[PDB]
Symmetry: none
Subunit: 32 residues, 18 copies
Amino acid sequence: GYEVHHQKLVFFAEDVGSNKGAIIGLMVGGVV
Amino acid sequence: GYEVHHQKLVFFAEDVGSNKGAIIGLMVGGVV
Amino acid sequence: GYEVHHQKLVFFAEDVGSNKGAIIGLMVGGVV
Amino acid sequence: GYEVHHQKLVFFAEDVGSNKGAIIGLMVGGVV
Amino acid sequence: GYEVHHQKLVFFAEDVGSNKGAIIGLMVGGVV
Amino acid sequence: GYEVHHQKLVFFAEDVGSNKGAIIGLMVGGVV
Amino acid sequence: GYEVHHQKLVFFAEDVGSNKGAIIGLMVGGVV
Amino acid sequence: GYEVHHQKLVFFAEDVGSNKGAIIGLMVGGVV
Amino acid sequence: GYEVHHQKLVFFAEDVGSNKGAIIGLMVGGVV
Amino acid sequence: GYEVHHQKLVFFAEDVGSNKGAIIGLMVGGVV
Amino acid sequence: GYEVHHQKLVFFAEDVGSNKGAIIGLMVGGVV
Amino acid sequence: GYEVHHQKLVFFAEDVGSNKGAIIGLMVGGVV
Amino acid sequence: GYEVHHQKLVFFAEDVGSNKGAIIGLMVGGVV
Amino acid sequence: GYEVHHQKLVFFAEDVGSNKGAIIGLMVGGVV
Amino acid sequence: GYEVHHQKLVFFAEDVGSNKGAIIGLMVGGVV
Amino acid sequence: GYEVHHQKLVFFAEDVGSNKGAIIGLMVGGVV
Amino acid sequence: GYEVHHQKLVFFAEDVGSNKGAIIGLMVGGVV
Amino acid sequence: GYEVHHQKLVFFAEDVGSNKGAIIGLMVGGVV
């Protein structure tokens, strides 16, 4: 029938006073 | 009776005096 | 109030004040 | 009548950070 | 008939030249 | 009805030319 | 007329009365 | 006289003898 | 003497009424 | 100084209709 | 100095306007 | 003199000109 | 005596160390 | 004193070879 | 106050007639 | 002292036509 | 007040066509 | 007082201009 495809990726980063901050190792998704 | 698809990932990092914070090792499947 | 299969992840790192904060290891096998 | 196959994951690091160094290990087999 | 295929990708970084302090290794999507 | 299929990519970085600063190893999408 | 080392991948797909929720995740190390 | 050894995968999606449509996740240790 | 190795990939997809809606995620290797 | 080595890749899809979950994610090789 | 090394790539498929809807992410080879 | 090594690609598809149809992210090779 | 926190892995493989079962499979939670 | 945090890996392999079956598998995830 | 961090990889491998017969499959990290 | 981070990759190897030699598969930590 | 980060890649070896299976597959970098 | 960073790759081997030699699939650098 009818299908709509979209995605939202917001990458916002400052850059001083920078400690290690954070680490993300992740698997999320693959199909539908 | 409507078929739609979306994704939503918000990656925000501030270079505060915010230290490691956390380490995320995750495998979460969202496929079917 | 109709929705379809989509991803939803909020990854945010800011003004951490405590310590390491958290170490997380989690896995799923076989998405419904 | 229609099912929405997705998961809600909010991962954030701020003032609050649980304990000095908390570790979480979890394994699941068979999402239903 | 209505069919659309797009994606919202937004990346903002301030004060470059020095390490941000954040690392994301992640897999999201693939098929829809 | 109008049908279109293209990506929307927007980004801005201050003090560019050096290194990325943070590192995002991310896979977003693949098949419509 | 001499045997040699080679890979063998036979992926055949015919759905049948094989519905939506068929997922298999499996890892086998030759010797380990 | 060289040994000729390789792995072989036969994945057939058909009326196999598993479940009507199950979800499985697992691993096997080759040798110990 | 003589050494000849070749790959063998046979990927075949049909299209009856029940659609190709299954997930194969496997890792075969490691050793031997 | 004579050697023979080629790959055999056979990708086949007819009267396609792949939807809901057609995904093969495989790590094949590593050793021999 | 003569050598015989070529690849054999065979692709057979339908190419209508709607995408088939299937993805093969496979690492075949590595070692031999 | 000159070695004998070249690629050999043969592809046959119906209604070409449009989109790929499916996506094969396949790494074939590694070592002979 | 100076205390420096860094990674250090020396993998030396020789006809030694291997005994009563040269196959190792181990995992460590979060903090050593 | 000052702490020196750096990466360091020395992979050294001689080539004897008859051995029980030298296979090593190790996983870490979080902090040391 | 001041710290020094750098990579250092020494990959050394011999070539006698008998291969050592060693495989390293590891996940090293766990920030430190 | 001053913060310094330089690269150092030394690959020393003998690649004759004897046995496999060695297989290293490793994820070397993101931070420190 | 200042930092130093230069590249340094050195490869010393026998550049013949390839051992049966000398393979280094590693992820080094990410952060510091 | 000034930041210094540039490329430096040195490939040395005994044989000829130099083929691949061994198989290094290594990710180096990326981010300090």
